[PDB]
Design a protein around this ligand. Structure first.
Ligand code: 6RM
Ligand code: GLU
Lengths: 280, 279
C-alpha cells in the first residue's frame, strides 16, 4: 500500500530543515526559477547518543527526495518519509548474534519498506538486502582544511599515524565497513575507530574548527562541501570507487520496476538534470 | 549442473581473441578456450566450431567468477549479431543468446540498459560506462546537447559525426535525439578501428560511442591526439554487466562475488592490468 521511506540527513542528497509554525515547508525556488519540491519527513531532533528521541515533522528536499518523487509518480505508489531513528547508514555489529543498525536495521525490521538515500552498495549489505542498479557512481576521498598538505590515502601521516594528525570517518557507515574489512588498512582503521564521528556534518564542522585534520568520506558529498565552503578542500582523487543505490527487502514487489526506472532516468538525462540541480 | 554455456564477443581490451597454439594446439598463459562457429560457405547452414583462445579484462573477471562461484564453462563467441539489438521484436547478439537460453550468461563489454533489462537480468556493474564523444584535441563541443549535434544543418559545412550502429549507443541516440540520429546514419562506422582512422585522417569530426572503450582508446592514442570531450565526460552513465536469464539461480552468488572483487582491490588490479594508458 503506502511505502514507509527511510532517509538520512546528507547534503546535498537530503536537506533537513524545521517546518514553519503552521507545520508546512518554506516555499523555495532554484536559481532556475523552478519550485523546490519538499516532503514532510518525521524524525528526532535531540541527536544526543543514549538519549530519548522525540519525533517531530521536519522538511526534506534534495537529489534523493526528487528521485523519490519520480519513482513514486512512475510506479504509482504513495509514501511517508521518516529520518533514520539512530542517524546512521548501517553496519552489522556483533551483539553470539549479529545485528544491523541504521537504515539497514530499519529496512530489515520492517520500520521502513525502502531506503532512499546516498546508500553505498557493498557486499556486506547486498547479502541481506536488494540494491537497485546505481543512481550515482562516486568514491572515497579525503577532506582537509585549506593549507593541510596530505598527498592522499598513501600519505605517511595516514599510513603511519600519531595523535598529532587526527583523521576519521562516520561511525556505522560503509566507509567504516571498508576500513574494518581490508587488513591492508587496519593501521588506519585502528586510528579512525578512536576518533570517528556520529554524522558527516559533525565531522565536516570538526575539520573547520581545526579539531579534525582529515575526514575520509564520500566524494559526492565532500566535493559538494568543498565547492560551498572555500576554507575546505579535498585531497587527491578517489582511492576507492563506489555507487549509491535504492535499498529494498529481497522480497519487495517493487524491486524490478525501481531498477528499470533508475535506468530510464539515467538514459533520458533525468539523473544528469538532478546532478546539475543539486550537485554541479 | 555447474557446467555453463557462456557467450562472449571480441572487443579489446575487455575481450581479445587469439589463434590456438601451433605446437600445443591448446590455450596457454592468461588465455582460456573459446569456440567460434564458422560457416563452410554461404550456400549452406553447415559450419564448424573453430577452437580459439580468449583473454582480456572480462575474461579475468570470468576466471575469478568460475573459481569463487564454483562453476566450469564452455565459452563461445556470438555469431548472430553483436552485443544485442531487438530486430522485429527478436533479440540477437549476446542478449539474444541469453533470452533464447543458448547461454546461461553473457560475459563481455555488455552495456546495461532498460530495454535489455526487460528481457534479461543484469549483475551489478563491474565497469562504469555510458556514452562519450571522441574528438581531435581542442575540438569545441560542449557535449551531446551541443547545437553542432542537435541541429547539425545549422552549420556550414555541417559537423561530421557517427557511431557504430546496432548497439546501446545508437539506441540511446535514437530514443533521445531523433533529428541527430537520422542525420548521423550516413556517418555509421563499421567498427571502432574504422572510426579512429576516419577521425585521425579528418573524415569525421566526432565519434560517439561506449565510454569505457573510448577512454581506453584515448589513453593509447599515438601522439595523444584523440580525446574524449570534458574531463572524460559520460552521458547516460551505466555499466557493463553480466547478462543472465530472468530468475537465474546464479545471479545472487555472481553479484556477491563481483562486489567482493570490488571491495578487495581485485577489480582495481584488473583495471591497472588491462585499461590504463599513457595519455
Ligand atoms: C565496479 C563498479 S563500476 C560501476 N559503475 C557505476 C556507474 O553507474 C551505473 C549506473 C547504472 C547502471 F546500470 C550501471 C552503472 C556504478 C557502480 O556502482 N559501479 C561499480 C560498483 C560495484 C558496483 C555496485 O553497484
Ligand atoms: N557496449 C555496447 C556496444 C557499443 C556501443 O553501442 O556503444 C552494447 O552493449 O551495446
Amino acid at each position: 500500500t503506502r511505502l514507509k521511506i527511510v532517509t538520512i540527513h546528507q547534503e546535498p542528497f537530503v536537506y533537513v530543515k524545521p517546518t514553519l509554525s503552521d507545520g508546512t515547508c518554506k516555499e523555495e525556488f532554484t536559481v532556475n526559477g523552478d519550485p523546490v519540491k519538499k516532503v514532510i519527513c518525521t524524525g528526532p531532533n535531540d541527536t544526543s547518543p543514549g538519549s530519548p528521541r522525540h519525533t517531530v515533522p521536519q522538511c526534506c528536499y534534495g537529489f534523493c527526495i526528487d528521485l523519490l518523487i519520480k519513482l513514486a509518480r512512475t510506479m504509482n505508489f504513495t509514501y511517508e518519509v521518516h529520518l533514520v531513528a539512530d542517524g546512521k547508514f548501517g553496519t552489522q555489529e556483533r551483539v553470539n548474534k549479529k545485528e544491523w543498525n541504521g537504515m539497514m536495521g530499519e529496512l530489515l525490521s520492517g520500520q521502513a519498506d525502502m531506503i532512499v538515500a546516498p546508500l553505498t552498495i557493498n557486499n556486506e549489505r547486498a547479502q541481506y538486502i536488494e540494491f537497485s542498479k546505481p543512481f550515482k557512481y562516486q568514491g572515497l576521498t579525503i577532506l582537509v582544511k585549506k593549507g593541510t598538505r596530505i598527498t592522499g590515502i598513501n600519505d605517511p601521516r595516514l599510513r603511519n599515524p600519531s595523535d598529532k594528525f587526527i583523521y576519521a570517518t562516520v561511525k556505522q557507515s560503509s566507509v567504516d565497513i571498508y576500513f574494518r574489512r581490508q587488513v591492508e588498512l587496519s593501521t588506519m582503521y585502528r586510528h579512525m575507530e578512536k576518533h570517528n564521528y556520529e554524522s558527516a556534518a559533525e565531522a565536516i564542522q570538526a575539520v573547520r574548527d581545526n579539531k579534525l585534520h582529515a575526514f575520509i568520506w564520500d566524494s559526492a558529498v565532500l566535493e559538494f562541501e568543498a565547492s560551498q565552503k572555500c576554507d575546505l578542500v579535498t585531497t587527491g582523487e578517489l582511492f576507492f570507487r563506489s555507487g549509491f543505490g535504492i535499498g529494498m527487502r529481497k522480497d519487495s514487489p517493487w524491486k524490478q520496476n525501481v531498477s528499470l526506472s533508475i535506468l530510464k532516468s539515467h538514459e533520458n538525462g533525468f539523473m544528469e538534470d538532478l546532478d546539475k540541480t543539486w550537485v554541479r | 549442473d555447474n557446467h555453463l554455456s557462456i557467450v562472449t564477443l571480441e572487443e579489446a581490451p575487455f575481450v581479445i581473441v587469439e589463434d590456438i597454439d601451433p605446437l600445443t594446439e591448446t590455450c596457454v598463459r592468461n588465455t582460456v578456450p573459446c569456440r567460434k562457429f564458422v560457416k563452410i560457405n554461404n550456400s549452406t547452414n553447415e559450419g564448424m566450431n573453430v577452437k580459439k583462445c580468449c583473454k582480456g579484462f572480462c575474461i579475468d573477471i570470468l576466471k575469478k567468477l568460475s573459481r569463487t562461484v564454483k562453476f566450469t564453462y564452455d565459452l563461445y563467441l556470438v555469431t548472430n549479431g553483436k552485443h544485442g539489438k531487438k530486430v522485429n521484436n527478436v533479440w540477437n547478439g549476446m542478449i539474444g543468446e541469453v533470452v533464447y537460453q543458448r547461454a546461461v550468461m553473457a560475459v563481455g563489454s555488455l552495456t546495461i540498459n532498460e530495454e535489455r533489462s526487460e528481457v534479461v537480468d543484469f549483475s551489478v556493474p563491474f565497469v562504469e560506462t555510458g556514452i562519450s564523444v571522441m574528438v581531435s584535441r581542442g575540438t569545441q563541443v560542449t557535449g551531446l546537447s551541443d547545437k553542432k549535434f542537435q541541429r547539425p544543418h545549422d552549420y556550414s559545412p555541417p559537423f561530421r559525426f557517427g557511431t557504430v550502429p546496432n548497439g546501446s549507443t545508437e539506441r540511446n541516440i535514437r530514443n533521445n535525439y531523433p533529428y541527430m540520429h537520422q542525420y548521423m546514419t550516413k556517418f555509421n562506422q563499421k567498427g571502432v578501428e574504422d572510426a579512429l582512422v576516419s577521425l585521425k585522417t579528418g573524415k569525421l569530426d566526432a565519434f560517439i560511442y561506449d565510454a569505457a572503450v573510448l577512454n581506453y582508446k584515448a589513453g593509447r592514442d599515438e601522439g595523444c591526439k584523440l580525446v574524449t570531450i570534458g574531463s572524460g565526460y559520460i552521458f547516460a552513465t551505466t555499466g557493463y554487466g553480466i547478462a543472465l536469464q530472468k530468475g537465474s539461480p546464479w545471479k545472487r552468488q555472481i553479484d556477491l562475488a563481483l562486489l567482493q572483487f570490488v571491495g578487495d582491490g581485485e577489480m582495481e588490479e584488473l583495471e591497472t592490468l588491462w585499461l590504463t594508458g599513457i595519455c
